[PDB]
JSON list of N, CA and C in Angstrom, two decimals:
[
{"chain": "A", "resi": 1, "resn": "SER", "atom": "N", "xyz": [-8.10, -2.69, 13.92]},
{"chain": "A", "resi": 1, "resn": "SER", "atom": "CA", "xyz": [-6.71, -2.25, 14.25]},
{"chain": "A", "resi": 1, "resn": "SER", "atom": "C", "xyz": [-5.75, -3.45, 14.20]},
{"chain": "A", "resi": 2, "resn": "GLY", "atom": "N", "xyz": [-4.47, -3.22, 14.38]},
{"chain": "A", "resi": 2, "resn": "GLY", "atom": "CA", "xyz": [-3.48, -4.33, 14.35]},
{"chain": "A", "resi": 2, "resn": "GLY", "atom": "C", "xyz": [-3.14, -4.68, 12.89]},
{"chain": "A", "resi": 3, "resn": "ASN", "atom": "N", "xyz": [-2.31, -3.88, 12.27]},
{"chain": "A", "resi": 3, "resn": "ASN", "atom": "CA", "xyz": [-1.92, -4.13, 10.84]},
{"chain": "A", "resi": 3, "resn": "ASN", "atom": "C", "xyz": [-3.17, -4.27, 9.95]},
{"chain": "A", "resi": 4, "resn": "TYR", "atom": "N", "xyz": [-4.16, -3.43, 10.17]},
{"chain": "A", "resi": 4, "resn": "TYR", "atom": "CA", "xyz": [-5.40, -3.51, 9.35]},
{"chain": "A", "resi": 4, "resn": "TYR", "atom": "C", "xyz": [-5.54, -2.26, 8.47]},
{"chain": "A", "resi": 5, "resn": "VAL", "atom": "N", "xyz": [-6.42, -2.31, 7.49]},
{"chain": "A", "resi": 5, "resn": "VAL", "atom": "CA", "xyz": [-6.65, -1.15, 6.56]},
{"chain": "A", "resi": 5, "resn": "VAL", "atom": "C", "xyz": [-5.47, -0.97, 5.57]},
{"chain": "A", "resi": 6, "resn": "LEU", "atom": "N", "xyz": [-4.38, -1.66, 5.79]},
{"chain": "A", "resi": 6, "resn": "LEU", "atom": "CA", "xyz": [-3.22, -1.53, 4.85]},
{"chain": "A", "resi": 6, "resn": "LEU", "atom": "C", "xyz": [-3.19, -2.74, 3.91]},
{"chain": "A", "resi": 7, "resn": "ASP", "atom": "N", "xyz": [-3.33, -3.92, 4.46]},
{"chain": "A", "resi": 7, "resn": "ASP", "atom": "CA", "xyz": [-3.33, -5.16, 3.62]},
{"chain": "A", "resi": 7, "resn": "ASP", "atom": "C", "xyz": [-4.54, -5.18, 2.68]},
{"chain": "A", "resi": 8, "resn": "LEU", "atom": "N", "xyz": [-5.66, -4.65, 3.13]},
{"chain": "A", "resi": 8, "resn": "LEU", "atom": "CA", "xyz": [-6.89, -4.63, 2.27]},
{"chain": "A", "resi": 8, "resn": "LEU", "atom": "C", "xyz": [-6.64, -3.74, 1.04]},
{"chain": "A", "resi": 9, "resn": "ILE", "atom": "N", "xyz": [-5.98, -2.63, 1.22]},
{"chain": "A", "resi": 9, "resn": "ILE", "atom": "CA", "xyz": [-5.70, -1.72, 0.06]},
{"chain": "A", "resi": 9, "resn": "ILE", "atom": "C", "xyz": [-4.70, -2.39, -0.89]},
{"chain": "A", "resi": 10, "resn": "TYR", "atom": "N", "xyz": [-3.77, -3.16, -0.37]},
{"chain": "A", "resi": 10, "resn": "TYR", "atom": "CA", "xyz": [-2.79, -3.85, -1.27]},
{"chain": "A", "resi": 10, "resn": "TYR", "atom": "C", "xyz": [-3.48, -5.01, -2.00]},
{"chain": "A", "resi": 11, "resn": "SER", "atom": "N", "xyz": [-4.54, -5.55, -1.45]},
{"chain": "A", "resi": 11, "resn": "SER", "atom": "CA", "xyz": [-5.27, -6.66, -2.15]},
{"chain": "A", "resi": 11, "resn": "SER", "atom": "C", "xyz": [-5.66, -6.18, -3.55]},
{"chain": "A", "resi": 12, "resn": "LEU", "atom": "N", "xyz": [-6.00, -4.91, -3.67]},
{"chain": "A", "resi": 12, "resn": "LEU", "atom": "CA", "xyz": [-6.35, -4.34, -5.00]},
{"chain": "A", "resi": 12, "resn": "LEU", "atom": "C", "xyz": [-5.06, -4.00, -5.76]},
{"chain": "A", "resi": 13, "resn": "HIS", "atom": "N", "xyz": [-4.03, -3.61, -5.05]},
{"chain": "A", "resi": 13, "resn": "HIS", "atom": "CA", "xyz": [-2.72, -3.27, -5.69]},
{"chain": "A", "resi": 13, "resn": "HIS", "atom": "C", "xyz": [-2.23, -4.43, -6.57]},
{"chain": "A", "resi": 14, "resn": "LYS", "atom": "N", "xyz": [-2.31, -5.64, -6.08]},
{"chain": "A", "resi": 14, "resn": "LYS", "atom": "CA", "xyz": [-1.85, -6.81, -6.89]},
{"chain": "A", "resi": 14, "resn": "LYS", "atom": "C", "xyz": [-2.76, -7.01, -8.10]},
{"chain": "A", "resi": 15, "resn": "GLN", "atom": "N", "xyz": [-4.04, -6.81, -7.92]},
{"chain": "A", "resi": 15, "resn": "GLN", "atom": "CA", "xyz": [-5.00, -6.97, -9.07]},
{"chain": "A", "resi": 15, "resn": "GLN", "atom": "C", "xyz": [-4.62, -6.01, -10.20]},
{"chain": "A", "resi": 16, "resn": "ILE", "atom": "N", "xyz": [-4.19, -4.81, -9.86]},
{"chain": "A", "resi": 16, "resn": "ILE", "atom": "CA", "xyz": [-3.78, -3.83, -10.90]},
{"chain": "A", "resi": 16, "resn": "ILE", "atom": "C", "xyz": [-2.42, -4.22, -11.48]},
{"chain": "A", "resi": 17, "resn": "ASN", "atom": "N", "xyz": [-1.53, -4.69, -10.65]},
{"chain": "A", "resi": 17, "resn": "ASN", "atom": "CA", "xyz": [-0.17, -5.11, -11.13]},
{"chain": "A", "resi": 17, "resn": "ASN", "atom": "C", "xyz": [-0.28, -6.34, -12.03]},
{"chain": "A", "resi": 18, "resn": "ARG", "atom": "N", "xyz": [-1.00, -7.35, -11.60]},
{"chain": "A", "resi": 18, "resn": "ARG", "atom": "CA", "xyz": [-1.14, -8.58, -12.44]},
{"chain": "A", "resi": 18, "resn": "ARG", "atom": "C", "xyz": [-2.11, -8.32, -13.61]},
{"chain": "A", "resi": 19, "resn": "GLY", "atom": "N", "xyz": [-3.07, -7.45, -13.43]},
{"chain": "A", "resi": 19, "resn": "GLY", "atom": "CA", "xyz": [-4.03, -7.14, -14.52]},
{"chain": "A", "resi": 19, "resn": "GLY", "atom": "C", "xyz": [-3.30, -6.43, -15.67]},
{"chain": "A", "resi": 20, "resn": "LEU", "atom": "N", "xyz": [-2.42, -5.52, -15.34]},
{"chain": "A", "resi": 20, "resn": "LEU", "atom": "CA", "xyz": [-1.66, -4.80, -16.41]},
{"chain": "A", "resi": 20, "resn": "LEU", "atom": "C", "xyz": [-0.29, -5.46, -16.60]},
{"chain": "A", "resi": 21, "resn": "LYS", "atom": "N", "xyz": [-0.27, -6.76, -16.78]},
{"chain": "A", "resi": 21, "resn": "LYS", "atom": "CA", "xyz": [1.02, -7.48, -16.98]},
{"chain": "A", "resi": 21, "resn": "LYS", "atom": "C", "xyz": [0.86, -8.55, -18.07]},
{"chain": "A", "resi": 22, "resn": "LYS", "atom": "N", "xyz": [-0.09, -9.44, -17.91]},
{"chain": "A", "resi": 22, "resn": "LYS", "atom": "CA", "xyz": [-0.29, -10.50, -18.94]},
{"chain": "A", "resi": 22, "resn": "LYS", "atom": "C", "xyz": [-0.87, -9.90, -20.23]},
{"chain": "A", "resi": 23, "resn": "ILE", "atom": "N", "xyz": [-1.69, -8.88, -20.12]},
{"chain": "A", "resi": 23, "resn": "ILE", "atom": "CA", "xyz": [-2.28, -8.24, -21.34]},
{"chain": "A", "resi": 23, "resn": "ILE", "atom": "C", "xyz": [-1.36, -7.09, -21.79]},
{"chain": "A", "resi": 24, "resn": "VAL", "atom": "N", "xyz": [-0.80, -6.37, -20.86]},
{"chain": "A", "resi": 24, "resn": "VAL", "atom": "CA", "xyz": [0.11, -5.24, -21.22]},
{"chain": "A", "resi": 24, "resn": "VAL", "atom": "C", "xyz": [1.44, -5.78, -21.77]},
{"chain": "A", "resi": 25, "resn": "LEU", "atom": "N", "xyz": [2.04, -6.73, -21.08]},
{"chain": "A", "resi": 25, "resn": "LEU", "atom": "CA", "xyz": [3.34, -7.30, -21.57]},
{"chain": "A", "resi": 25, "resn": "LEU", "atom": "C", "xyz": [3.09, -8.48, -22.52]},
{"chain": "A", "resi": 26, "resn": "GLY", "atom": "N", "xyz": [1.85, -8.75, -22.87]},
{"chain": "A", "resi": 26, "resn": "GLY", "atom": "CA", "xyz": [1.55, -9.89, -23.79]},
{"chain": "A", "resi": 26, "resn": "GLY", "atom": "C", "xyz": [1.27, -9.37, -25.21]},
{"chain": "A", "resi": 27, "resn": "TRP", "atom": "N", "xyz": [1.17, -8.07, -25.40]},
{"chain": "A", "resi": 27, "resn": "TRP", "atom": "CA", "xyz": [0.89, -7.52, -26.76]},
{"chain": "A", "resi": 27, "resn": "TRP", "atom": "C", "xyz": [1.97, -6.50, -27.15]},
{"chain": "A", "resi": 28, "resn": "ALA", "atom": "N", "xyz": [3.21, -6.91, -27.16]},
{"chain": "A", "resi": 28, "resn": "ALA", "atom": "CA", "xyz": [4.33, -5.98, -27.53]},
{"chain": "A", "resi": 28, "resn": "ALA", "atom": "C", "xyz": [4.92, -6.37, -28.89]}
]
């Protein structure tokens, strides 16, 4: 408890955002 279970889910959110950025915005 105490701001928990939310930050762990966002840890993956950044991996998807940065994962689909250098390869997605790098081949246009």
